[PDB]
A paper describes a structure:
The crystal asymmetric unit of BrUSLEE contains three dimers AC, BD, and EF. Each dimer comprises two monomers related by a noncrystallographic twofold symmetry axis with a side-to-side packing at ~120°. The principal structural fold of the BrUSLEE monomer, shared with all other members of the GFP family, is an 11-stranded β-barrel with loop caps from both sides. The nearest shell of the Gly65-Tyr66-Gly67 chromophore is composed of 19 residues, forming an extensive H-bond network around the chromophore. The substitutions increased the free volume around the chromophore, causing a 0.7 Å shift of the hydroxyl group of Tyr66. The mutation of the chromophore Thr65 to Gly shifted the H-binding of catalytic Glu222 from Thr65 to the imidazolinone nitrogen, and the replacement of Phe165 with Tyr led to the formation of an H-bonded chain–Tyr165∙∙∙∙Arg96∙∙∙∙O=C-imidazolinone. The replacement of Tyr145 by a relatively flexible met facilitated the conformational change of Thr203, accompanied by a disruption of its H-bond with the Tyr66 hydroxyl. An increase in the distance between the His148 side chain and the Tyr66 hydroxyl from 2.89 Å to 3.52 Å indicated the disruption of another H-bond, typically stabilizing the position of the chromophore. These rearrangements in the nearest chromophore environment did not affect its absorbance and emission spectra but greatly impacted its FL, which predominantly depends on the chromophore’s local microenvironment. Compared to the EGFP precursor, which is characterized by an increased packing density in the chromophore area, in BrUSLEE the stabilizing contacts of the chromophore with the environment were noticeably weaker.
Residue numbers in the entry:
A (entry chain A): 1 to 64, 68 to 231
B (entry chain C): 1 to 64, 68 to 230
The structure:
């Protein structure tokens, strides 16, 4: 078993820190929880430590650790995410909200001690103050999406594309095209995968005891799209 | 604002039974776990006792305990489900798969000891053998849906309509019109609510150790549409 894989055989504690700025609105988010790569399961609680969140939590879901995906035995040679650990990897994305603004995020996912940490900087621009994002017009949920992964030998990493369909209250959808890139932080070799996808599910809830602006998040992710 | 609701202040253990007949394909399912109505949380594991499951697991999620919904304080007046307990209620559905067969279901949801139990009888019919259902063409997932609820004093229960969209592998969708009816077991008083809805979220996973055909189901349901 790979040296990186061995780090994910059990439950792993997680910390997430995010500094964001959307149209001048600055906000910070803190996250705590754990992941079980064996089950492809991830449980996290997030707190907007600066007060009210100026954007809807659902738009932050992809930003706030694919290393907790479940790669079946037959697909373990395609797990870039776990193979770059514990030095970790950089996750960069540009999210384009159809007919509205865009996020630019850069993050480092790596072990600090025994804990896997996701440190993020997010910058948003061109948002319509009356729009679905700044106007908080999005339902508090997240639909199932397939995340497509493709190797990039020359950058020693992976390229990932997918478009999110956020439910709007009225009964329509807001599109958010995701363009992602992951490169290892360490100098050690990683696994370049063949084209595949992650089948991702998210459930969002609240803690009735929590008064701060918050999001309880559950993800269920399993790699697929390759035979045995 | 009733006796029933007091039964759900904690974590309540659950059992589920289904016996299935679909285009003659007979099958049986057992489920266990727990529900936590104050978080609107429901965790259940189901196994197909009778070998490989003839239909996709997502088509049965609606069938395999809306009494585990979180009703916010200012809305308890409208929680029919917990108001019919411990006695219990009968949940009855017809589900029409657009351009495909239909499922009929009668279930009995009520306590049996300290345990809440959902006993289901399901009949499916007119399904296209190479249709999305029997053809096993549905993605293994369940998108969020609103479940609309209307009071019906005639039968001293509620009427319910929702449309499920099951993702099909190819990226298209399979419609499933849910028509539902909930009547009490007991003859005690139950609460008949003004029009509201349940925001329903469902996540499906596998136990990597479980060697039978199964589904792990997690549900987060909160009532809304009134303040």
């Amino acid at each position: 078993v790979s040296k990186g894989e061995e780090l994910f055989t059990g439950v792993v504690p997680i910390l997430v820190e995010l500094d964001g700025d959307v149209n001048g609105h600055k906000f910070s988010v803190s996250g705590e929880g754990e992941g079980d790569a064996t089950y492809g399961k991830l449980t996290l609680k997030f707190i907007c430590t600066t007060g009210k969140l100026p954007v809807p939590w659902p738009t932050l879901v992809t930003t706030l650790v694919q290393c907790f995906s479940r790669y079946p035995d037959h697909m373990k040679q395609h797990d870039f995410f776990k193979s770059a650990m514990p030095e970790g990897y950089v996750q960069e994305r540009t999210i384009f909200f159809k007919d509205d603004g865009n996020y630019k995020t850069r993050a480092e996912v790596k072990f600090e001690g025994d804990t896997l940490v996701n440190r993020i900087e997010l910058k948003g621009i061109d948002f319509k103050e009356d729009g679905n994002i700044l106007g908080h017009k999005l339902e508090y949920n997240m639909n199932s999406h397939n995340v497509y992964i493709m190797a990039d030998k020359q950058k020693n990493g992976i390229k990932v594309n997918y478009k999110i369909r956020h439910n709007i209250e009225d009964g329509s959808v807001q599109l958010a095209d995701h363009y992602q890139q992951n490169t290892p932080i360490g100098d050690g070799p990683v696994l370049l995968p063949d084209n595949h996808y992650l089948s991702t599910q998210s459930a969002l809830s609240k803690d009735p005891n929590e008064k701060r602006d918050h999001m309880v998040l559950l993800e269920f992710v399993t790699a697929a799209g390759i035979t045995l």
